Amino acid sequence: AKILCVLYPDPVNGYPKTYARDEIPNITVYDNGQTAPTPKAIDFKPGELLGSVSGELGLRKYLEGLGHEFIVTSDKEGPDSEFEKHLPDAEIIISQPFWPAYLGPERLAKAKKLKLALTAGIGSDHVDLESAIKHGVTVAEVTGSNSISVSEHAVMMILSLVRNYIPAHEWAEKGGWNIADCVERSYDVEGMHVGTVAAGRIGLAILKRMKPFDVHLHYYARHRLSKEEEEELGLTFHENVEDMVKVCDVVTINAPLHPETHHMFDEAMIKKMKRGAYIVNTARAEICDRDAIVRAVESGHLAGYAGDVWNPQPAPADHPWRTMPWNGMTPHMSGTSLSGQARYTAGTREILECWFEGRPIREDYVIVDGGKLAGTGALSYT
Amino acid sequence: AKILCVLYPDPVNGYPKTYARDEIPNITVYDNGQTAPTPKAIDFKPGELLGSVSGELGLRKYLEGLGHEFIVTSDKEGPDSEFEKHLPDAEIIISQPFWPAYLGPERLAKAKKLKLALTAGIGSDHVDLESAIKHGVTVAEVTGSNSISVSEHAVMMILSLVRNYIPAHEWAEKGGWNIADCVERSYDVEGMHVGTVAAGRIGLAILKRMKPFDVHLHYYARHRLSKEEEEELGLTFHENVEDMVKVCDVVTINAPLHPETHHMFDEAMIKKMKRGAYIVNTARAEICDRDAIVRAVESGHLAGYAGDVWNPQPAPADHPWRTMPWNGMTPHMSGTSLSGQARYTAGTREILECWFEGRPIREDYVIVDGGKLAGTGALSYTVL
Ligand SMILES: NC(=O)c1ccc[n+]([C@@H]2O[C@H](COP(=O)([O-])OP(=O)(O)OC[C@H]3O[C@@H](n4cnc5c(N)ncnc54)[C@H](OP(=O)(O)O)[C@@H]3O)[C@@H](O)[C@H]2O)c1
Numbered sequence: 153a154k155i156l157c158v159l160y161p162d163p164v165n166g167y168p169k170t171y172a173r174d175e176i177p178n179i180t181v182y183d184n185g186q187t188a189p190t191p192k193a194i195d196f197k198p199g200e201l202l203g204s205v206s207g208e209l210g211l212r213k214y215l216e217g218l219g220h221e222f223i224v225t226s227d228k229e230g231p232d233s234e235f236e237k238h239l240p241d242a243e244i245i246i247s248q249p250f251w252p253a254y255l256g257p258e259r260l261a262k263a264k265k266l267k268l269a270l271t272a273g274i275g276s277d278h279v280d281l282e283s284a285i286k287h288g289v290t291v292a293e294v295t296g297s298n299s300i301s302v303s304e305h306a307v308m309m310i311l312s313l314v315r316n317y318i319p320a321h322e323w324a325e326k327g328g329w330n331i332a333d334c335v336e337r338s339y340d341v342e343g344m345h346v347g348t349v350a351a352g353r354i355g356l357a358i359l360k361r362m363k364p365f366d367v368h369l370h371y372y373a374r375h376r377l378s379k380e381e382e383e384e385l386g387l388t389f390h391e392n393v394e395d396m397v398k399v400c401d402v403v404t405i406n407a408p409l410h411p412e413t414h415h416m417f418d419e420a421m422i423k424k425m426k427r428g429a430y431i432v433n434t435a436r437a438e439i440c441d442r443d444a445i446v447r448a449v450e451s452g453h454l455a456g457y458a459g460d461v462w463n464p465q466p467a468p469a470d471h472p473w474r475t476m477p478w479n480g481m482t483p484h485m486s487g488t489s490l491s492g493q494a495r496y497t498a499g500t501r502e503i504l505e506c507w508f509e510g511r512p513i514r515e516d517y518v519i520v521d522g523g524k525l526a527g528t529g530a531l532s533y534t
Numbered sequence: 535a536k537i538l539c540v541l542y543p544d545p546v547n548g549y550p551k552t553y554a555r556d557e558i559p560n561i562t563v564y565d566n567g568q569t570a571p572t573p574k575a576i577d578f579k580p581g582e583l584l585g586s587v588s589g590e591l592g593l594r595k596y597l598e599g600l601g602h603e604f605i606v607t608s609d610k611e612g613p614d615s616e617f618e619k620h621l622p623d624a625e626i627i628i629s630q631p632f633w634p635a636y637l638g639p640e641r642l643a644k645a646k647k648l649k650l651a652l653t654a655g656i657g658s659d660h661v662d663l664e665s666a667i668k669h670g671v672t673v674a675e676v677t678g679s680n681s682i683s684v685s686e687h688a689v690m691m692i693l694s695l696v697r698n699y700i701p702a703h704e705w706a707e708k709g710g711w712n713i714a715d716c717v718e719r720s721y722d723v724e725g726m727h728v729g730t731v732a733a734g735r736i737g738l739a740i741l742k743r744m745k746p747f748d749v750h751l752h753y754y755a756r757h758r759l760s761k762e763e764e765e766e767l768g769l770t771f772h773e774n775v776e777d778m779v780k781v782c783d784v785v786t787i788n789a790p791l792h793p794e795t796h797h798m799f800d801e802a803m804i805k806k807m808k809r810g811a812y813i814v815n816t817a818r819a820e821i822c823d824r825d826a827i828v829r830a831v832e833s834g835h836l837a838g839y840a841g842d843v844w845n846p847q848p849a850p851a852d853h854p855w856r857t858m859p860w861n862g863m864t865p866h867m868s869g870t871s872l873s874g875q876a877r878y879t880a881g882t883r884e885i886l887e888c889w890f891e892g893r894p895i896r897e898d899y900v901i902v903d904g905g906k907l908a909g910t911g912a913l914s915y916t917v918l
């Protein structure tokens with residue numbers, strides 16, 4: 153059928169001629185024991201840029217290797233768009249969260265022939281998980297691929313906030329020194345209290361990583377961890393997120409976006425956070441109330457917020473977070489480092505393979521199949 | 535005795551009335567057993583700006599109860615310096631490496647009653663230690679004080695380079711998205727080889743901190759860590775740094791500045807390093823040929839460099855490290871975060887007590903005493 157794939161604009165220097173490196177580490181196995189994607193053939197050197205229009209997830213050889221139709225495009229907005237154009241007769245839709253072709257109920261209505269909305273990466277929140285059920289449609293996402301990538305992003309975005317990196321940097325770039333104005337905001341993270349919403353692949357990664365920084369490790373999930381996990385890391389479990397946000401000076405959000413978590417960090421929850429506390433949100437923007445976050449920083453109740461997730465995506469030029477005080481922001485770039493691109497593209501292939509050769513699709517990669525939250529969907533999403 | 539303490543400009547918008555936090559952790563022990571400072575008292579709230587002029591490290595009430603004179607300036611360049619002015623009769627001098635009072639042989643010649651050249655923080659390399667040995671002077675830093683501050687500042691820098699943070703936070707501020715532009719240089723550190731040049735308090739810190747990133751861990755040093763530490767961290771020692779930099783995707787430099795480390799990283803050394811390697815230097819700038827860094831950087835042989843330390847500090851505005859491609863530089867700062875100031879301005883104090891009281895100064899604190907390298911200094915530093 154028509155496979156349709158929404159990928160991001162190429163670099164403004166055009167698709168990369170050469171890269172900064174000759175290769176990247178080979179990664180085969182994850183922490184919880186899960187294996188890295190296992191496609192039979194890949195048609196790209198890992199470490200290459202697969203996630204833009206030109207990269208095309210190195211898929212064009214395999215898909216027009218059964219002479220299927222394979223369209224690629226960054227144009228994805230409103231009903232005149234290239235995406236909206238090819239949408240109705242498409243059977244497999246592929247997009248990445250970094251550049252998400254959203255699939256609400258009406259965009260689901262128009263897609264007459266859609267059988268598999270396939271998230272290249274993690275978090276299928278851009279997809280109306282209910283509607284999907286109504287139309288029998290199947291939804292799968294490359295679970296694990298880029299969780300370690302994100303974890304590195306978060307930790308980094310923590311130290312950048314607590315130590316006030318970006319600003320001090322902003323000085324030295326423009327000729328200055330200004331030490332004194334640098335370290336008025338600069339605290340060690342050491343012996344602070346730090347809190348992960350969720351302790352899934354990311355939240356557990358982040359914890360394992362902050363532990364050697366001699367901080368006191370707290371966390372909310374809906375089920376506890378093992379004892380030997382909780383002891384080896386030396387955690388402090390919290391039933392309420394309320395509970396946790398009172399004691400923690402740093403909170404990392406690391407939970408999926410579904411209606412439980414919608415606006416969890418609204419002005420409501422911001423109350424109980426300690427003055428000068430910090431939020432790293434690498435999970436999904438809509439877990440925070442945008443206009444709440446802003447104020448609590450402007451107000452000064454929050455020392456800082458940083459994150460790579462926004463809403464919508466792209467976020468509008470005028471999105472307050474961008475310019476907001478002490479923002480440690482980036483575009484949505486953690487899941488799609490070259491290192492992680494390697495894995496979610498593989499998986500993207502793997503998942504197409506089993507679908508095209510009739511064979512099954514890993515439990516782990518499946519969010520929705522056959523009208524119910526199955527596999528990862530059942531444990532993580534609502 | 536006259537005391538002569540050199541501090542740095544207060545914030546352009548005045549010494550601050552309030553700070554966005556109301557307390558900081560209570561660090562009392564260190565990861566080697568060593569105790570934190572043990573002063574008798576303080577004249578500051580742990581977590582106020584102390585290394586600023588107006589901070590006076592909470593001393594101006596101690597020294598004058600004891601009835602000694604206390605000078606404080608951020609003017610130390612030229613002959614004009616208020617510093618060189620009070621230098622001669624200065625019985626005790628204190629500076630912080632962030633705004634260091636450089637004590638060349640000229641200055642140590644023209645200092646006539648100095649008995650104690652004291653480093654606020656760590657890093658007594660703004661001082662000729664030979665001049666200090668001959669002039670019979672005693673020298674000390676606050677060993678431990680801010681080792682952990684730095685160890686974090688590095689790691690953040692490692693991640694920041696390897697993932698292309700600033701470039702991409704630039705794109706955030708300038709209302710773009712341009713993902714391909716962010717990630718075309720962005721990598722995960724997971725899997726890479728990382729090496730620290732020294733494996734001191736700091737270098738060791740970094741090793742422990744980096745370990746759970748599943749990187750491979752290399753290090754050079756003149757002596758080795760123990761069998762226990764080399765096991766639990768999966769450390770690879772090298773006997774030539776040349777052999778370390780060859781395999782390492784990332785090098786952090788955590789060595790003192792002294793003759794063996796001066797321009798360790800020349801163009802010769804830098805050459806050996808992998809294509810697209812990264813350096814982090816949260817130690818002392820002059821361990822790398824400033825000029826050769828920039829060559830390597832521009833030529834895409836080194837994918838980046840990051841560090842707070844420079845030479846000189848403070849530094850020219852057209853220092854090419856400020857503008858070179860893909861830098862992750864801060865002004866000298868890692869060690870004078872507020873959390874660490876509260877420790878070096880307590881060591882600062884504790885030692886002044888051990889001088890006027892006439893008790894042994896803590897051997898860990900001591901660089902030069904008795905006309906020779908001793909303490910930290912005997913194990914860490916060296917002289918021609
Ligand atoms: N580039 C990026 O920024 C990027 C990349 C990848 C992923 N992400 C986001 O991060 C999310 C986390 O993925 P992951 O790597 O952690 O995989 P995961 O193993 O599926 O983690 C999800 C975790 O969320 C917990 N959870 C679900 N609903 C919750 C709720 N209402 N409150 C608290 N915890 C809840 C689940 O445990 P319980 O069921 O026991 O609560 C589970 O441990 C993804 O879904 C995605 O939205 C962002």
Ligand SMILES: NC(=O)c1ccc[n+]([C@@H]2O[C@H](COP(=O)([O-])OP(=O)(O)OC[C@H]3O[C@@H](n4cnc5c(N)ncnc54)[C@H](OP(=O)(O)O)[C@@H]3O)[C@@H](O)[C@H]2O)c1
Pocket residue numbers: 655656657658659677678680681684731732733734735736737754755756757758788789790791794795816817818842843866867868869870910913914915
């Ligand atoms: N703001 C900042 O960025 C900041 C803050 C504080 C300190 N620093 C710098 O970091 C330095 C590290 O000292 P520290 O107090 O962190 O810990 P430390 O224990 O004082 O550091 C000394 C370590 O460096 C090693 N070392 C000494 N000379 C060496 C050489 N020539 N080649 C290789 N290794 C050598 C020593 O081991 P061996 O005996 O085996 O050589 C020892 O492991 C300070 O002296 C200072 O220069 C920077």
